[PDB]
């Protein structure tokens, strides 16, 4: 039913995750640069 | 006002969404559980005469 | 502008859906597959 | 006010361009109708009314253009 | 084997059996799923023969 | 808690109460809800074979599924005239396209390295034609990534505003005409038609987004 | 103000011409319908509701151009 | 504030001109669907999603022109 | 300045008019794919990727028009 | 200088129209390619290259138009 049979969750999904992290670093500085508040 | 009329109209549309004039997916689903149930009658019995 | 609790949270949402699908209902669909497979045999 | 009426007339004239659609639409509809009726006379009775309806709809779009041009004329 | 026939006639959960109960009845059903993922046989055939894929139109 | 975040919480509240909160028949059927998602699950699974198949289609299946779920749910409840849908900014749809492309290349650069640059020259286009094609191919790679994000969000914005603009006209019509009848139900009739279109387009554009992001994954994993 | 209203008028008039594309789209849909029913009379029932759908989509695009002209006029 | 608004309206109109191509395109994709299914009744399930997808592409194309128009409206 | 922004707006609007061809092009590409699958259903799998390739190229044309329009805007 | 830059923007917006022709042309090339390949699967290998090159420089024509628009902008 919800019997957890292990499947790839992080083993092969790393590239998009590290891409997201590389986005995040800079993704907050873009708002800081264009504060306009 | 105008906003209240729009919600009432979609509720009528949602009422028409309720009908779909005997929706196909209802019968498309109806064909499924019978198909699912019937094969379990045949498949389980298939090994029943295996010991028979 | 506002990104903190949405994009990181978006990937966390994808991870949660990944769990609740691939660990729960992919095994469920597979389990019914193999269940009826052994029902025939 | 002079420029207002001037551009109103200009807008009506440029809105009348839409009749090109009605014209070449009835054009292609009747061309297909001729091709179909020549293919076999049996299908003519079934195909003519819907071709007429398509003509009516294309010229209804043309009439919409004409009406908006009319609003930019009176 | 006669008791098996009497066993099957009144013990047919064809509409209410549990797959986890199938795990309990045979650990092989449990066993055969883990090494399936680890060895890389992600795709599973043998389904469309019995149930259609149920493709939307 | 911005409008985006609270909407995102509402998304997951609906997500769990379709298939996670039935879980009682211990069968493949027994609830027409289950038939619904497995239909969608099968349409994308066979699509995963048809587009990503050959070595690792099932490996990358969930991202296409999760993204399709994300776009599908975000487009369902988007018709009500007070639907402040996705903060009326839709900037994240661009962001999702950007991160999807950016992850696509890192996978390409990781799995191919310098060979990823050979993708710009599929079959022919010799040295005189090499600079022209690599310019078209590389600029295209930026091109459809940004286009994918903007087209979905703008049309949702376009659909939401054409809800309101036509609605204001109906308010004008029903207030001015005294005894006649054909002034407000025909504008109501278009409102009924234009709402079905917006509901319809979101369904396919979620599918189109699913097919597209699938299409770019092929190019990353497979060089042609 | 006068030039603003004048520009609104001419912009609406130029935006009207979407009905041209709507009419041609519905015309080509009906033309393909005619050819299909003539070649295969049996396929007529399968293709007619689809043709109605395509008609509706093209005329919806044209009518939306009409409302764009309307909002340029009155707004 | 006057001339800029006027040119904004004119740019909005000459960008709304773009929906012509989108309509003609969706219609011709669907026309090809009609002809293909008429010649081959068995390919309907194979070709219908493809033509619907092409429809969505061309409609999003016209909607892009529409958005370019809106950014010069509000 | 005001005339500069006005011409920016009108130039963006008249840059928008180059994507009707992109829409018609992607449409005729998908139409030809429908026709080819009608004639040769078996070759559909081989022939489909070129459809998306041509779609991407014509969309690239349309967004080149977008790039001109947007650089004219902001 | 105001009118000079204004008309430079207008000219760039008019010039970027070449992508319309580029897209229509590459799409008719693709359409003929698909029709021929479906009608002749064996011809695919020897009809791919010049079709690729042809729509490549058909797009290069629109690229030349875009470059004219660029020089008008700058």
XYZ file of C-alpha atoms in Angstrom, chain D:
74
model
C -11.738 67.134 -32.343
C -10.609 67.381 -35.965
C -7.866 64.809 -35.374
C -10.374 62.662 -33.461
C -12.741 62.367 -36.428
C -9.797 62.067 -38.826
C -8.395 59.047 -36.997
C -11.930 57.692 -36.559
C -12.285 57.594 -40.349
C -8.776 56.130 -40.657
C -9.650 53.415 -38.146
C -12.874 52.560 -39.958
C -10.993 52.309 -43.248
C -8.296 50.091 -41.753
C -10.924 47.958 -39.983
C -12.611 47.326 -43.334
C -9.511 45.288 -44.298
C -11.086 42.285 -42.550
C -13.410 41.667 -45.507
C -10.394 40.140 -47.262
C -10.890 37.260 -44.842
C -14.573 36.883 -45.675
C -13.820 37.004 -49.403
C -11.027 34.450 -49.576
C -12.839 32.356 -46.962
C -15.988 31.942 -49.036
C -13.508 31.468 -51.877
C -11.781 28.441 -50.377
C -15.028 27.039 -48.924
C -16.694 27.047 -52.341
C -13.528 25.675 -53.958
C -13.589 22.713 -51.574
C -17.338 22.362 -52.154
C -16.791 22.188 -55.922
C -14.012 19.630 -55.469
C -16.175 17.482 -53.196
C -19.289 17.613 -55.367
C -17.222 16.791 -58.460
C -15.604 13.886 -56.597
C -19.004 12.178 -56.291
C -22.526 13.632 -56.667
C -23.803 11.485 -53.780
C -22.060 13.568 -51.096
C -23.493 16.857 -52.408
C -26.686 16.722 -50.337
C -24.736 16.159 -47.116
C -21.943 18.626 -47.912
C -23.846 21.672 -49.224
C -25.633 22.833 -46.012
C -22.470 22.863 -43.895
C -20.572 24.664 -46.659
C -23.342 27.283 -46.639
C -23.027 27.500 -42.851
C -19.273 28.023 -43.174
C -19.874 30.784 -45.708
C -22.322 32.359 -43.266
C -19.759 32.237 -40.452
C -16.891 33.662 -42.531
C -19.093 36.507 -43.731
C -20.244 36.920 -40.118
C -16.626 37.640 -39.193
C -16.527 40.024 -42.149
C -19.726 41.634 -40.863
C -18.116 42.013 -37.431
C -15.306 43.950 -39.105
C -17.917 45.964 -41.013
C -19.840 46.758 -37.819
C -16.726 47.930 -35.977
C -15.918 50.107 -38.991
C -19.485 51.432 -38.738
C -18.889 52.359 -35.095
C -15.828 54.276 -36.339
C -18.076 56.065 -38.861
C -21.124 57.278 -36.887
